[PDB]
């Protein structure tokens, strides 16, 4: 199996095969530890942000990939944002401080 | 496990006393379980299910 | 001779471990609840755990466990507290219904008479009917009909 950019899940935006075109491989915690033991942060950030969970980041990246510019403008992963909303829906006030 | 009566032990680990223990269990094909079991004080007990 | 919950506690501590079934029956006849256990396994588990590896602090994980044992009656489940709270109210007697209804009649008719003794309560109705025949209102929005 192989995938570049496929479909995406509605609830949380994450790669999901709907066409029998398969969803991406799952990058787990142990794998994250593997990237953590190596000195590679960017591989990991792009792994769990732009390549996957960032709804803006994925497209904003794709345009750069085709433009011939390799970068990332990561933003915030949609999962953690969903968790912000889920926590904040309770009587719990969660804020992002400073600047 | 076949329906009927069944006699077990649970020796060792129970209450770490080495005193063992003994329990009988009546298991119906369909219905409630009838359990009988001792304790360290040698007082017989019964529990449904 | 008695006090219950010690007993499962003191035994759970000396053994160092208790099966998930061991606490259920050894629990007092007071707290039988299913979701009761959920947090109390977490209580005994930070102090000497058996969930069948913890904090050696203990202490307040006992005093608060004794507070939950005293908290063991009211099963909550508002169907219950309701069914019980209404179950106090005494059944009505065939004549008692008439008593109460008569009391109602006395009350309402009182407020109605009090309304009729107010001049403005009259004048308002007059002006309102003056608005009805003036096509500024309708008959249904003033009266539901008189006696008739």
């Amino acid at each position: 199996h192989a995938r570049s950019t496929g479909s995406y899940s509605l609830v949380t935006q994450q790669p999901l095969g709907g066409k029998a075109q398969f969803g991406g491989q799952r990058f787990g915690e142990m794998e994250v530890w593997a990237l953590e033991a190596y000195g590679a942060a960017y591989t990991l950030q792009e792994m769990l942000t732009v390549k996957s969970d960032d709804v803006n980041g994925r497209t904003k990246m794709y345009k750069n990939i085709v433009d011939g510019n390799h970068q990332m403008e990561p933003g915030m992963p949609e999962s953690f944002n969903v968790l912000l909303k889920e926590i904040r829906s309770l009587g719990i006030n969660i804020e992002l401080e400073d600047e | 496990r076949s329906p009927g009566v069944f006699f077990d032990s649970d020796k060792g680990k129970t209450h770490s006393s080495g005193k063992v223990l003994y329990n009988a269990r009546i298991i119906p094909y369909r219905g409630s379980w009838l359990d009988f079991e001792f304790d360290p004080k040698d007082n017989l007990f019964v529990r449904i299910d | 001779p008695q006090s219950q919950l010690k007993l499962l506690v003191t035994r759970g501590k000396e053994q160092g471990y208790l099966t998930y079934a061991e606490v259920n029956d050894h629990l007092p006849e007071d707290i039988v609840d299913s979701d009761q256990i959920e947090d109390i396994i977490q209580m005994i588990n930070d102090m000497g755990i058996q969930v069948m590896n913890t904090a050696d602090e203990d202490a307040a994980e006992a005093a608060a466990q004794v507070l939950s044992s005293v908290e063991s009656g009211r099963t909550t489940d508002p169907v219950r507290m309701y069914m019980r709270e209404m179950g106090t109210v005494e059944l009505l007697t065939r004549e008692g219904e008439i008593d109460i209804a008569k009391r109602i009649e006395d009350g309402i008719n009182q407020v109605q008479c009090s309304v009729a003794e107010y001049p403005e309560a009259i004048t308002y109705l007059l002006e309102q009917y003056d608005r009805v025949e003036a096509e500024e209102a309708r008959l249904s929005d003033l009266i539901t009909g008189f006696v008739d």
Partner: protein
């Protein structure tokens, strides 16, 4: 010794304690204790070893 640890006295009392054990939180009834206990291991409907 088991009898010494027995809180009950007569048949009805034991039936009350059993009914209270099976379905706690709610008031016992004579017909309810009898019905339950007879319907547990003694009923041709609710019980079979085959």
């Amino acid at each position: 010794e088991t009898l010494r640890v027995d809180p009950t006295n007569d048949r009805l009392s034991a039936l009350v304690e059993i009914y209270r054990m099976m379905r706690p939180g709610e008031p016992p009834t004579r017909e309810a204790a009898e019905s339950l206990f007879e319907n547990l291991f003694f009923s041709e409907d609710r019980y079979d070893l085959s």
